[PDB]
Amino acid sequence: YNVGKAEKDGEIRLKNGVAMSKEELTREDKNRLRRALKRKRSK
Amino acid sequence: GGGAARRQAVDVSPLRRVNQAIALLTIGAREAAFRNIKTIAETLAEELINAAKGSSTSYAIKKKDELERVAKSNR
Amino acid sequence: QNYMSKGDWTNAFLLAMTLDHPMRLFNVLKRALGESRSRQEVIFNEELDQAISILNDEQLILLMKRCRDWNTNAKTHTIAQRTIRCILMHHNIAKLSEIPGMVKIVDAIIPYTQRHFTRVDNLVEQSYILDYALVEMDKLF
Amino acid sequence: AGSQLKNLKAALKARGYDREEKKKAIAEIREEFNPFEIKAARNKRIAVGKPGISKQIGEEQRKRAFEAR
Amino acid sequence: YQRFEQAAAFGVIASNANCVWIPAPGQLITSALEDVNIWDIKTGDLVSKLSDGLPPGASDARGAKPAECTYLEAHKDTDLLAVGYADGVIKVWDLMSKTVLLNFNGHKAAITLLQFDGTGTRLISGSKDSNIIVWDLVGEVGLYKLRSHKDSITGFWCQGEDWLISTSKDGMIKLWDLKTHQCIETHIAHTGECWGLAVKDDLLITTGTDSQVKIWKLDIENDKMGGKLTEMGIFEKQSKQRGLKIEFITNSSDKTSFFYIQNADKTIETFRIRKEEEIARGLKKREKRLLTEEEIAKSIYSSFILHPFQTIRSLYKIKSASWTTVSSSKLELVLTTSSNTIEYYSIPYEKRDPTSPAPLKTHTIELQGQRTDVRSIDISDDNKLLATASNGSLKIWNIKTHKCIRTFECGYALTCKFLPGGLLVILGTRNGELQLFDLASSSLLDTIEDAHDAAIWSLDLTSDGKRLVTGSADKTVKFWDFKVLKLHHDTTLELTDDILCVRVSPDDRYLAISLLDNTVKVFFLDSMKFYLSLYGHKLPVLSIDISFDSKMIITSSADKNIKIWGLDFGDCHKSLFAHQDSIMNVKFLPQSHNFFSCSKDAVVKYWDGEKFECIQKLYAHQSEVWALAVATDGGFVVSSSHDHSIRIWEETSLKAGERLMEALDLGIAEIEGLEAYNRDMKLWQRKKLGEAPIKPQGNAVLIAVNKTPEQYIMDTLLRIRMSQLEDALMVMPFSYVLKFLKFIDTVMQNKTLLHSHLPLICKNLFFIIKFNHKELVSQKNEELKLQINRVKTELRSALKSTEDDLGFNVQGLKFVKQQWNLRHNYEFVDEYDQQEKESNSARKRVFGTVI
RNA sequence: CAACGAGGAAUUCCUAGUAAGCGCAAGUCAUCAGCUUGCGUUGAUUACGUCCCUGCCCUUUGUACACAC
C-alpha cells in the first residue's frame, strides 16, 4: 500500500500522508496547493 | 569582509612550514649574494649556519619572527 | 474551530470525525497525545478515548483509513499507533474483524508497523553507547 | 565580473504607442552592446578607433573610384 | 514641448459612493469622482471641493485611472473626514485645513465601509476583498486584520474593544471577539447574499436579496457557542430588490426608534419600531381565542414589534441616504440618487399619524448636473460651454466660473453646436426632431418636427455659420440655411446606408461624411461632386476631422484605431492603433496638425500628425468619454464623459553548525541562569530570608519569538538539514557538546517535546557522543556522569514505551486478520488446489525489468 | 651640455616532462621568412583543497525495485 490520491473530491491527499480537506483549507493554502499541483503536473 | 583590511591569525601546517622554510632560506641566499663579493654557495652557507643556530641575523628567521609576531599581534 | 482553539479535544475530535476534516483530526489527535504524555490503561484523556470507544462502524473504518495513511510516514506514525491501540483495546475484536473493509486496511498496515518496530528496536540497540560510555567513565578511576 | 547577458537583460529592464523612443533605445543598446566594432587600447597612465566603419568608407570610396574609371 | 494639464473638473454633484451629513438644515459632504465636495443644503452653492493637491495630468501623475472615491465617513466632534477609494487606500483629512493627515492603503480591492470607534483614534474599514482591518490613528498602524469572510464586506457594527459583528456578500453574518481576533459565531443569514446590517442594542436587523428582512436577538453576555446571536423571525417588504442600507435612530423627548431600509430602485422603506408598553398591551390581542396553536401563532413576532411607515419614493434610482430627527415630526432625510442629484426630504408624524399621503422634499440640489451622460459637448469662441443630455438638460456652463447659467429642455439629444456669433445653439435629437435655442431669451426659437425620418446622428455648421448639414440614420443627409433666424431645408442627399457622421472642412471646401458601411465619402460642397471614398476601416466608423489647411483628415471608429488620410489623393498615411475599446471622438487643434482623441475606455490621448507619436496619455476620467471639444483659438480642450464629468485641459549569513552553536550558547545560558535563580530561591527560602538575587530578565529573542529555550534550540536543530547535520555536529567543539548534553538532559523532562522529536534527539545525541567518545570518557565530573545516566534512562524509557505499542499493534492486527481468515477463508484440504488458490488470490505487482 | 644598470599603476597566462633555459633542422597547395612549424637537451616552485569572494550551471515529486534516509 502506498498513499495515492484521495477517493473523494473535497479532499487533497499528498503522498506524505497528510490528507487535507478543501473545506478546511484556508484560501492561502488553497492557492499554494494549486500552484504546487501545477508544478508537479509541469514536471 | 569584502576587503576590510583586517588579518586573522591562523596556524600553519607542517608541509607549508617546510615549503616556506626552503623558500626563505634559498631566496635569502640569493638576495644576500645579489651584488656582494660572495657567491650563492658562500651566502647559502652563512644563511644555513645562522639559521641552524637561530641567530636572528638571517633573512629567513627574521622573516619568520616577523610573520609570527604579526600573527601574535592580530591574533 | 472554537473547540480546536479553546482546547477541549473530545468534542473537537467527534466534530472533526463528523465533518471528515482529516488534517484537523490529525491535529486534535496529536495535540491530545502530546498533552497525554505531559500529564502523568488509558492513553489519551479518558473522555476522548471513551469518545473513540463509542463510535460506530463507518466512523471507525474512516478512522482506521486515516490511521492507515498516517502510518506510512515515520514521523506521523506514533499518532496512528496510539489510535490503533485504543481502538483495539476499547472495541470488540470480533466486531472489528467482521466490519466489511477491515482487512484491506489492517493488511495494509501490518508491514508498516513491522518496519517501524525494526527501526525503533535498532534505536534501542544503538542506545547502549551511553551505557558503554558510562562503564568507561566509571573505569576512569 | 557579471555577464554580458545579465547586463543586457538589465539594460532592457532599464530602457523598457510611441516609436522613436524604441528606435533610440534599440540603436543605443545595439551600439553599446556591440564591442567588436570599436577598438580599445589600454591607457598606460578607451575607444581608439571604429574599424568596420573606417573599412566600409575606405572600400566604398575606391568602389566609386573604380566604377568612375 | 508645451504639454497639457487639467485646470478644473465639474459637472458631478453625487457620484458612485455614500454621503455623510454634518449639522449646522445642515451641510452635506458627498463624493465627486476621486475628490469630495461639501454642499450647504439651504442654498446649494459649492462651498468646498476638497481635492488631491496634484492635478491629474501633471508630470508625476501615474499611468492609470485615478482612484475613485467610494466611501465617505465623518468624525463630527474632532472634525475629521475618513474617505476611502477604489484601489483600497484611505485618506483621513482635517476639515479645517483640508490637508491629508493619514494614508492607510492596507487593502487589495475597493473598500465598502468605514467607521470611527471609541469616538476618536480608531477606524475600522471593510472592503470588497473580504478582510476587515482596524487602524489606530495615534500610531498610523493597521492593528488587526479580521480575516474569515469570503466575498465582500457589506456591513458591520462594533462596540469599542470586545465585539464586532460583520456581514458579507456571501450569505454569512459573523461575530468577532476583538481580543483574540478569531471569529466566534457564524450563521447563514440569507440564502443568497446579505446586504444589510443595523442594530439598536437589543435587536439586530439584516436584509438579503429580495424582501426577506430578518430580525435577530444578540445576547452579548451569552456563553453557549451557537447562541450569542439567535434568529427571531422574518418579514416582508414592498420591494423585491436588494435592500442594501439599514439605519436606526433614537429620537429623544419620549424615547423612540426609527430605521430605514433603502432599496435598489427608487424607494426607501421607513419603519417605526414600537415600545415595550405596546408590546405588552398588544400581546394579548393576537393571544385571543382561548395553547400549542396560540404558542405557534405567538412564535410566528416581526410584524408585532415592527411598524411600517411612510414609504418615501423618488424620481430616480437611489444610491445613499442618511437622516436627522427632532420632535418625531421632523424625520429629515437627505438622499443622494444615482443620476447626480441630492434631495432633502422630511416626513412629519404627529406621533400617531404621518400627516401626509406621500412625503415632501424640502430641498433639492440638482442644478450643476445633467441626470444623464452628456452625449455632446461644445464651446464658444472661448467663454461659454454647451452640454447636451438625454432628459433634455441642455446646459450652458461658463469656463471662468464652472457654473451653468442657462438651461433648457430638449429631449434625447445627441449632437449640438453653437452659432458663429455666439449666444445661439443648434441641436438635433434622437427622434426626427431638430431644435434651436439661444442665451438671452427663453428656450425655443423654433423646433423642426420631421427634420429627419429617423435618428439624427451628426450636424455641422459651415465656418460662416449660415448653412448647416444634418446627417441621420434615415440614410439621408440634408442641408439647411438660416433665413431671417429660421431653418430652410433646400436640398437632401439620400444614400444607400445610414450616415452617422458629417463634417465640413474649416474653409468651406469639403464635406466628409461617415457612413455605417465601414467607409467615409468626401464630397465637394459646391457640386456634391463625390471627390473621394476612403475605405478599409472594417467596422462602422465614428468621428472625422479635417485639418486647418484642409489637407489631412482623421478617421475614428470602433476598430480601436484612428486612420490618417491625405485628402489630395485619398491616400492613407498611418493606421495607428490606440485605445483598446472604441474611439468616440477625435478633434484637431486650431492651428497645428496635433490632435486629440477621446475614447470609450476612459482616456483621452494627445497625438501629433507629423511623427505620429502619442504626445500625452491623459487619465482623469473614470468611464466612457463621450465627447470632447477644442477651443477655437488658443487651444484648451474640454472633455465630457459617462461618469457625469466635464473637465478642462489647458497648457502647462551563518550556516548549520554555527547557528546551532549560538543557539546552544544562548539557550543554555538562559537555562542555567534560571537554575541558578531556582537555587537562590531555595536557599533564601531555607535560610534567613533577608536577601536573594534580584531578577534574571528573560532573553530578548526568547521572549520575542515566545519560546522556551528548549523549543528554540529544538526548532533550529530541526531547521538544519539532514545532508549537513553530520557536519553541523562535527564542527562544534567539546564545550558545545557538553552544553548540548545539558540541553538534551533538560529536554527529556518536558515529555511533550521529547516524544515529538524522539528520532531526531536519538540521531543527534548518538552521533554526538559516538564522534566525541574519546574525550567524553576522559572527562572526570560526577555531574556529567549523572547527566548521562539520566538521559540514558529517560531516552530508553521513551523508546521502549513507543515500541511497546508498536509490538502490541502488530500482534493485535495480525490476530484480527487471522481470525477473519479462519472465519471465512476457503475450504481446500488438498494442498495443490490450496496453493493454486492462494497464488490466484495473491497480491500482484508488475515491475519493469531489463534483460 | 642625449638614452640606459631588470622596467610604475594596472593587466594577461599558467599545474609534470608542465613554466622556464638551450640550441638544431625544415619551409610540405592555406598561413609564414620583419617569420612559421617541427626536433631533441636541461628541467623546477606552488595548488591538487574549497565554494568564503567573483561568476557560470543544475535541481526543487526520490521514482528507478528492495534496505535505509
Q: What is the 3-state secondary structure (H, E, C) of E308-375?
A: ECCCEECCCCEEEEEEECCCCCCEEEEEEECCCEEEEEEECCCCCCCCCCCCEEEEEECCCCCCCCCC
Rounded-to-integer distance, Cα A10 and Cα E178, Å: 31
Instruction: Give the E window 157-186 contacts with C, CB below 8 Å.
Output: 180, 182-184
Q: Which bases on strand F have an atom closer than 7 Å to a protein beta carbon?
A: 8-10, 45-47, 53-57, 60-61, 63-65, 67-69
Cα D17 from chain centroid (whole Å): 27
Q: Which residues pair with E563 in a beta bridge?
A: E555
**DSSP bridge pairs for E520:** E514, E534
Nearest-neighbour CA in chain E from D32: distance (Å): 25
Measured from the Cβ of residue E246, the count of other Cβ atoms closer than 10 Å reads 22
Closest CA to E16 of E136, E110, E139, E122: E110
Residue B52's Cβ-count burial label (10 Å; 0-12, 13-18, 19+) is exposed
The residue type found at E696 is P
Q: What is the DSSP string of E207-267?
A: E-SSS-EEEEEE-TT--SSTTSEEEEEEE--S--S---EEEEEEETTTTEEEEEEE-SSSE
E435 conformational bin, left if phi > 0, alpha if psi -120 to 50, beta if neither: beta
Three-state secondary structure string covering E693-750 = CCCCCCCHHHHHHCCCHHHHHHHHHHHCCCCCHHHHHHHCCHHHHHHHHHHHHHHCCC
- Cα–Cα separations (whole angstroms), residue A9 to A22, A27, A30, E156: 8, 17, 14, 35
- Whether residue D16 lies within 8 A of chain E, CB to CB, comes out as no
With an 8 Å Cβ cutoff, are C72 and A21 in contact?
A: no
- E578 and D17 in contact by Cβ < 8 A? yes
Give the CA count within 13 Å in the CB-facing half-sphere of E83.
31
Shortest CA distance to E791 belongs to which of E811, E766, E810?
A: E766
**Is residue E425 a contact partner of residue E436, using CB atoms and an 8 Å limit?**
yes
CA-to-CA separations, E105 to C7, E83, E127, E141, E164, in angstroms, rounded? 36, 11, 11, 10, 22
| CA B49, chain centre distance (Å) | 14
Sort C82 into a burial class: Cβ within 10 Å, 0-12 / 13-18 / 19+: buried
Give contacts of C23 with chain A, Cβ < 8 Å: 18-21, 24
Render E650-685 in DSSP notation, one character per residue: EE----TTHHHHHHHHHHHHHHHHHHHHHHHHHHHH
Contacts of E561 in chain D (CB under 8 A): none
Rounded Cα distance, E618 and E598, in Å: 9
Residues in E closer than 8 angstroms to D20, CB to CB, are 611, 613
Q: Which of residues 194-233 of E touch C (CB under 8 A)?
A: 225
DSSP state of E752: H
Compute the distance between CA of residue E497 and CA of residue E516 in angstroms, rounded to an integer. 6
Breaks (C-N over 2.5 A) in chain C follow: 40
Nearest CA to D12 among D31, D1, D25? D25
SS3 E451: coil
Contacts of E663 (CB under 8 A, 6+ apart): E712, E713, E716, E717
Question: What distance in Å separates the CA atoms of residue E375 and residue E161, rounded to the nearest whole number?
Answer: 51
A39 vs A33: CA distance, rounded Å: 10
Using alpha carbons, list the distances in angstroms from residue E302 to B39, E220, E237, E566: 122, 21, 12, 74
Which residues, in sequence order, are CB contacts of C2 under 8 Å at separation 6+?
A: E184, E225
* E579 vs E601: CA distance, rounded Å: 7
Say which residues have a Cβ less than 8 Å from residue E185's Cβ, sequence separation at least 6: E174, E175, E225, E226, E227, E228, E229
Radius of gyration of chain C (CA): 18
Check CB contact under 8 Å for E225 and C96.
Answer: no
Contact residues, chain C, for A3 at CB < 8 Å: 69, 72
- Protein-to-nucleotide distance from the CA of E68 to the C1' of F27, whole angstroms: 87
Taking the C-alpha atoms of residue E262 and residue E247, their distance in angstroms, rounded to an integer, is 9
Burial class (CB in 10 A: 0-12, 13-18, 19+), E334: buried
Instruction: Judge: C72–A11 Cβ closer than 8 Å, yes or no.
Output: no
Helix (H) or strand (E) holding D56: helix D51-68
Nearest chain D CA: its distance from E153 CA (Å): 39
Q: How many CB atoms lie within 10 A of CB C100?
A: 9
For residues B55 and B57, give the distance between their C-alpha atoms in angstroms, rounded to a whole number: 5
Residue (of E401, E346, E337, E332) closest to E365 by Cα position: E337
Partnered with residue E159 across adjacent β-strands are E163
Task: Find which nucleotide's C1' atom is closest to D7's CA.
Answer: F55
What's the rounded Cα separation, in Å, for the pair E744 and E47? 75
Q: CB under 8 Å to E38, separation ≥6 — which residues?
A: E22, E27, E28, E29, E46, E47, E48, E49, E50
Touching chains C and A? (3+ Cβ pairs < 8 A): yes
Length of chain D: 69
> Which segments within E473-551 are labelled E, that is strand?
476-483, 486-494, 499-504, 510-515, 519-524, 532-535, 544-546
Residues of E in contact with D18 (CB under 8 A): 613-614
C-alpha cell at E538: 472594417
Neighbours of E714 (CB within 10 A): 23
Which amino acid is located at E780 in the chain?
K
Q: What angle do CA E134, E137, E140 make, to 5 degrees?
A: 85
CA distances, E520 to each of E65, E491, E511, E541, E545 (Å):
33, 20, 10, 8, 12
Taking contacts as CB-CB distances below 8 angstroms, the residues of chain C near A23 are: 19, 21
Q: How far apart are CA E326 and CA E248, in angstroms?
A: 14
Nearest nucleotide (CA of B2 to C1'): F53
Containing H/E element for E647?
strand E646-651
Distance CA E810, CA D9 (A): 62
User: Are the C-beta atoms of A22 and A12 separated by less than 8 Å?
Assistant: yes
Are E336 and E267 within 8 A, CB to CB? Answer: no
Type and span of the H or E element at E787: helix E782-824
| Measured CA angle at C120 (ends C36, E728), to 5 deg | 95
- Residue labelled with grid coordinates 641575523: B57
Which residues are CB-contacts of A10 (< 8 A; sequence separation ≥ 6)? Answer: A21, A22, A23
Q: In angstroms, what CA-CA distances link A36 with A20, A29, A42, A43, B20?
A: 14, 10, 10, 11, 57
Distance from CA of E32 to the nearest CA of C (A): 44
CB distance B26 to B48 below 8 Å: no
Nearest to C137 among E182, E750, E785 (CB): E785
Contact E625, E599 (CB under 8 A): yes
Residue E836 Cα distances to B21, C103, E280, E820, E833, angstroms: 82, 21, 86, 21, 5
Nucleotide nearest C116 (Cα, C1'): F68
Distance of D64 CA from F33 C1′ (whole Å): 37
CA atoms of E532 and E567, how far apart (whole Å): 8
CB contact under 8 Å between E611 and D17, yes or no, is no
Q: What is the Cα–Cα distance from D18 to D24, expressed in whole angstroms?
A: 11
How many CA atoms lie within 13 Å of E520's alpha carbon, on the beta-carbon side? 32
Burial label for C2, CB within 10 Å (0-12, 13-18, 19+), is middle
List residues in chain E touching D: CB distance below 8 A. Answer: 576-578, 611-614
- E779–C84 C-beta distance less than 8 A: no
Touching chains, A (3+ CB pairs < 8 A):
C
d(CA D28, CA D23): 8
Q: Closest nucleotide to residue B23 (Cα to C1')?
A: F45
Helices D4-15 and D20-32, axial angle in degrees (round to 10) = 160
N-term to C-term CA, chain B? 17
Q: Are A26 and C85 in contact (CB under 8 A)?
A: no
DSSP state string for chain C: -HHHHH--HHHHHHHHHHHT-HHHHHHHHHHHHHHHHH----SS-HHHHHHHHT--HHHHHHHHHHHHHHTTSSSTHHHHHHHHHHHHHHS-HHHHHHSTTSSTTHHHHHHHHHHHHHHHHHHHHGGGHHHHHHHHHHHT-
C-alpha cell at B24: 626563505
Say how many C-beta atoms besides its own lie within 10 A of residue E29's C-beta: 21
Q: Are E319 and E337 in contact (CB under 8 A)?
A: yes
Within 13 Å, how many C-alpha atoms sit on residue A21's CB side?
Answer: 14
Query: Which residue in chain D is spatially nearest to E614 when comparing CA positions?
Result: D18
Measured between alpha carbons, how far is A30 from E150 in angstroms, rounded to an integer?
13
- The Cα–Cα gap between E333 and E345 comes to 5
Taking CB atoms and an 8 Å limit, are C107 and E817 in contact across chains?
A: yes
Q: In what order do the strands lie in the sheet with E90-94?
A: E69-75, E80-85, E90-94, E100-103
Q: Is A19's CB within 8 Å of C24's CB? A: no
DSSP E116: E
Please tell me if residue C18 touches chain A, with a CB cutoff of 8 Å.
no
* Residues whose CB falls within 8 Å of the CB of residue C23, separated by 6 or more in sequence, listed in order: A18, A19, A20, A21, A24
All 3 cell numbers of residue E491?
436640398
Protein residue nearest nucleotide F59, by CA to C1': A43
CB-based contact E766 C103, cutoff 8 Å: no
Cell of E832: 495443490
- How far is Cα E195 from Cα E166, in angstroms, rounded to an integer? 11
CA E62/CA C8 separation, integer angstroms: 54
Question: Rounded to a whole number, what is the distance in Å from the CA of E576 to chain D's nearest CA?
Answer: 8
Residues E377 and E10: beta-carbon distance below 8 Å: no
Q: Which residue has the cell 456571501?
A: E170
Give the integer Cα–Cα distance in Å for C29 and E394. 74
Cell of E571: 491616400
- Helix H, strand E, coil C: the string for E792-807 is HHHHHHHHHHHHHHHH
What is the Cα–Cα distance from E20 to E35, expressed in whole angstroms?
A: 14
Q: Which letter, b or e, does each residue of C10-31 get, where b requires 16 or more Cβ atoms within 10 Å of its Cβ?
A: bebbbbbbeebbbbbbbbbbbb
Report yes or no on chains E and C touching (3+ CB pairs under 8 A). Answer: yes
DSSP state of A2: -
C-alpha–C-alpha distance, residues E750 and E376, integer Å: 80
Taking the C-alpha atoms of residue E310 and residue E328, their distance in angstroms, rounded to an integer, is 13
Rounded to the nearest angstrom, the minimum Cα separation between E744 and chain C is 13
Residue E398, Cβ neighbours under 10 Å: how many? Answer: 14
Q: Are the beta carbons of C76 and A24 separated by less than 8 Å? A: no
Straight-line distance from CA D5 to C1' F55, in Å? 12
Give me the total of CB pairs closer than 8 Å, taking one residue from chain C and one from chain E. 130
**How far, CA to CA in Å, does B75 sit from each of B11, B61, B70, E658?**
10, 20, 8, 21
Nearest CA-CA distance, residue D11 and chain E, Å? 22
Up-side HSE of residue D55: CA atoms within 13 Å toward CB?
6
User: How many CB atoms are located within 10 Å of the residue E90 CB?
Assistant: 23
Integer distance in angstroms from the first to the last C-alpha of chain E? 80
Using CB atoms, pick whichever of A3, A23, A24 lies closest to residue C69.
Answer: A3
- Could you give the CA distance from residue E476 to residue E492 in angstroms, rounded to a whole number? 7
Interatomic CA distance for residues E458 and E460, integer angstroms: 7
Size of chain C in residues: 141
Kindly list the distances between the CA atom of residue B5 and the CA atoms of B1, B74, B75, E246, E835, in Å, as whole numbers in the listed order. 8, 12, 14, 72, 82
Give which of B24, B18, B27 is closest to B64, Cα–Cα: B24
Q: In a 3-state reduction of DSSP, which class is residue B45? A: helix
Residues engaging strand F (CB under 7 angstroms): A 15, 36, 39-40, 43; B 2, 15-16, 19, 22-23; C 74, 115, 118-119; D 1-3, 5-6, 42-45; E 653, 722, 847-849
Going by C-alpha positions, the residue among E614, E590, E602, E596 that lies closest to residue E640 is E602
Which among C23, C68, C112 has the least Cβ separation from residue A20? Answer: C23
Chain E residues within an 8 Å CB radius of C114 = 810
Indicate contact of D with C: 3+ CB pairs under 8 A: no
Whose cell is 500552484? That residue is A35
Helix (H, G, I), strand (E, B) or coil at E600: coil
Q: Give CA–CA dist E579/E805, Å, rounded.
A: 73
Q: What is the CA radius of gyration of chain D?
A: 18
Nearest by Cα to E103 from E86, E120, E91, E121: E91
From chain E residues 491-530, the ones with a CB under 8 A of any chain C CB are none
Closest by Cβ to E814, choosing from C1, C110, C117:
C110
Find the angle CA(E533)-CA(E536)-CA(E537) to the nearest 5 degrees.
Answer: 110
What distance in Å separates the CA atoms of residue C110 and residue C84, rounded to the nearest whole number?
11
Question: How far is CA C7 from each of CA B16, C39, E301, E423, E843, rounded to the nearest angstrom?
Answer: 65, 15, 39, 81, 44
Measured between alpha carbons, how far is D46 from E757 in angstroms, rounded to an integer?
Answer: 64
Q: How far is A18 from chain C (nearest CA, A)?
A: 7
Residues of C in contact with E788 (CB under 8 A): 130, 133-134, 137
